[PDB]
Design a protein around this ligand. Structure first.
Ligand SMILES: Nc1ncnc2c1ncn2[C@@H]1O[C@H](COP(=O)(O)OP(=O)(O)OP(=O)(O)O)[C@@H](O)[C@H]1O
Ligand SMILES: [Mg+2]
Ligand SMILES: [Zn+2]
Ligand SMILES: [Zn+2]
Length: 606
């Protein structure tokens, strides 16, 4: 088998991402080059050609909103006609365009150049940054990763996250659902017997709920449900829609058309929201908001709640379904674990306490980091030689799979909350070329569920006395992803299997371009780095020589007025040169260094 190296655990979140590693019997959550244990899931393209990621991209959002990309997780794995995609793009500053019926991100990379990106490639960039953050901490290179996804992500969404991993040069070994991961972080070291645990994950863009059983070191997911388009960014968006309206009331101006203004508002709103988790009031002051004029308002916690109460309450609907599916009731639940930054909002904590008749949720557990914590643990296990505690994971598929039948009937195949890996065989007697439409979801009619894909069977052998019997097998792997194979029961030895997979996915050719484009950008970013670092060598060398000459105690007492004048001039010449050619290329600097060394070298060696 493969030497998988150190395996890293990544929480690839909507607004934030987090990387951990298991080593010396301990999880370390890894800080980035700015000393932050979490990293904004942002990428930006500066007018000067530069491609920024994380905190740096985020810090230039309001000065360059149209080419700062964010919330790409809300687009990953979706189609154009998805209602969720069409609602989202109405509040995104960067262009989003259809192609191959998928939403692609279109931006300006600088110098009049337009690039269109698949959300997978934007997520790849975020993951690459997380890879590098780890590689630095370890002092070595990394190739395998465990990556989280929300429990309720469907098949496309899982696959796309995996592809994203690939494009960033990572083998995604295991996709792990976020509440499961958090559960490990909660209940790894627990030795209290079988206890029912409810994990309530509310982050930046997605909502997951799972009921687990945790007996000692054995984790079993009983039931799962959530909303993949519901989170912090939606609370922010309600508070923005409000202040825009308010500002038009009070000033007559509609600021919706100016992305700078909106984005400045988003930034400060978010900051207000956070404050309102520990205060009752927050001033939102934005200087030079619109046209030239300043903005100034107060958001009370009460108002933040009126605006968002429908959304807060809708988190209880999946929590019910979870219990209903678990055949358990509220009093059975031993602990309710909260993860995701959005669970810091008091009203969410309150609605949860009330739903469980006054039961107090669990503290102790960092809601921003827990999900990566658990991923890191699961990475340790996969890294081979690590001393994690006992860990057993049984996790489930979240959505019933079925096929369309006469009428448009969702003829069920694999129920939801089935443990994975699982498979289901199915004999068909249709010959010729049969088309199978698979579907995802709990509704008894096909129209009302999500189309996963269309699988054509072209292989079937032709009979002498008629009709072939084909066994179609639907396997769901440990990651949650469907694979579909076939075999006929008419031939000994020959089994004739042909699956054309008419399905909205990046091809292996498309993935190859995007991987090579990523490798190009790395090389490009590497050379921009060599151009900076060698301009600095020159500039330092020059300044250093200028000290040594003016220093009568060391290298300037040794010089004659002839050689002193020639040194002063050679250095003074190259400095006011460097000051006016900042845009010079790598070879210009290499030359000027060597022009200056030519002259200095004979002189200093006397
Ligand atoms: N004190 C607070 N009060 C309210 N919201 C907060 C607070 N602290 C953080 N948040 C919110 O938490 C959200 C991010 O949490 P988190 O990082 O867990 O999600 P994520 O991993 O980015 O994405 P996903 O939803 O996909 O897991 C942000 O919207 C932020 O506004
Ligand atoms: Mg030149
Ligand atoms: Zn997260
Ligand atoms: Zn037991």
């Amino acid at each position: 088998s493969e030497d998988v190296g150190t395996v890293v655990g990544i929480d690839l979140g909507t607004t934030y991402s987090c990387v951990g590693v298991f080593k010396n019997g301990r999880v370390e959550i890894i800080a980035n080059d700015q000393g932050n244990r979490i990293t904004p899931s942002y990428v930006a393209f500066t007018p000067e050609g530069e491609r920024l990621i994380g905190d740096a991209a985020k810090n230039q959002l309001t000065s360059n909103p149209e080419n700062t990309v964010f919330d790409a997780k809300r687009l990953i794995g979706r189609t154009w006609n998805d209602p969720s995609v069409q609602q989202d793009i109405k509040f995104l500053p960067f262009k989003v365009v259809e192609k191959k019926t998928k939403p692609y991100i279109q931006v300006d990379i600088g110098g009049g150049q337009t690039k269109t990106f698949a959300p997978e490639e934007i997520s790849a960039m975020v993951l690459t940054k997380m890879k590098e953050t780890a590689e630095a901490y370890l002092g070595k290179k990394v190739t395998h990763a465990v990556v989280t996804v929300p429990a309720y992500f469907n098949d496309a969404q899982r696959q796309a996250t995996k592809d994203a991993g690939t494009i960033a040069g990572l083998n995604v070994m295991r996709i792990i659902n976020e509440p499961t991961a958090a559960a490990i972080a909660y209940g790894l070291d627990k030795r209290e017997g079988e206890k029912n645990i409810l994990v309530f994950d509310l982050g930046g863009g997605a909502f997951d709920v799972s009921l687990l059983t945790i007996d000692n070191g054995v984790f079993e997911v009983v039931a799962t449900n959530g909303d993949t388009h519901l989170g912090g960014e939606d609370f922010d968006q309600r508070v923005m829609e409000h202040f825009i309206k308010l500002y038009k009331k009070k000033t007559g101006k509609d600021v919706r058309k100016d992305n700078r203004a909106v984005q400045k508002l988003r930034r400060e709103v978010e900051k207000a929201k956070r404050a309102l988790s520990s205060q009752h009031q927050a001033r939102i002051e934005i200087e030079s908001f619109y046209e030239g004029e300043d903005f100034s308002e107060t958001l009370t916690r009460a108002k933040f709640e009126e605006l968002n109460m429908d959304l807060f309450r809708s988190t209880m609907k999946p929590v019910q379904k979870v219990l209903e599916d678990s055949d358990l009731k509220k009093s059975d639940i031993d602990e309710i674990v909260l993860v995701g930054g959005s669970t810091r909002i008091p009203k969410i904590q309150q609605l949860v306490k009330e739903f469980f008749n006054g039961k107090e949720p669990s503290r102790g557990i960092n809601p921003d980091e827990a999900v990566a914590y658990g991923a890191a643990v699961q990475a340790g296990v996969l890294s081979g030689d690590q001393d994690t505690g006992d860990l057993v994971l049984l996790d489930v598929c979240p959505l019933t799979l079925g096929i369309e039948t006469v009428g448009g009937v969702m003829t069920k195949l694999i129920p939801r909350n089935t443990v994975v890996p699982t498979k289901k065989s199915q004999i068909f007697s249709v010959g010729g070329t049969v088309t199978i439409k698979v579907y995802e979801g709990e509704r008894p009619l096909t129209k009302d569920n999500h189309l996963l894909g269309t699988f054509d069977l072209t292989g079937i052998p032709p009979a002498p006395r008629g009709v072939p019997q084909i066994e179609v097998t639907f396997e769901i792997d440990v990651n949650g992803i469907l694979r579909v194979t076939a075999e006929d029961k008419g031939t000994g030895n020959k089994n004739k299997i042909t699956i054309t997979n008419d399905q909205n996915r990046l091809t292996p050719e498309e993935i190859e371009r995007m991987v090579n484009d990523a490798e190009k950008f790395a090389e490009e970013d590497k050379k921009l780095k060599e151009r900076i670092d060698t301009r600095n060598e020159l500039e330092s060398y020059a300044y250093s020589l200028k000290n040594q000459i003016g220093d009568k105690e060391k290298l300037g007492g040794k010089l004659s007025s002839e050689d002193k004048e020639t040194m002063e001039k050679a250095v003074e010449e190259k400095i006011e040169w460097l000051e006016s050619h900042q845009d010079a290329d790598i070879e210009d600097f290499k030359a000027k260094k060597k022009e200056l060394e030519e002259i200095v070298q004979p002189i200093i060696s006397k």
